[PDB]
Amino acid sequence: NGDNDCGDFSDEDDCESEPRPPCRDRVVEESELARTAGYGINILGMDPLSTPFDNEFYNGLCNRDRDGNTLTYYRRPWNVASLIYETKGEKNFRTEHY
């Protein structure tokens, strides 16, 4: 049913039934975004690591992610519970004299 879990054509090895698409709407795949949500930061080490788990698998009906800067629809994997596109931003200044 167009659900890539194991490999490119591993799960799609043999299909006797028709290739029924899971979703008809055009939803662009998550390109370079938080799709790689796994991070293995070392408290004694340095910056976070890569993903220790698979983050491409999805379970059932597509969950729409109708948000972002431009007009485009991304996918949210079944492993990622939530993702927001809030463009928060802050900065501080300070100075003193002795």
């Binding site: 991070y39 930061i41 408290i43 080490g45």
Partner: peptide
Amino acid sequence: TYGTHYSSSGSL
């Protein structure tokens, strides 16, 4: 190899 503890929530 796989870090000490993973991230429950991040901030890109």
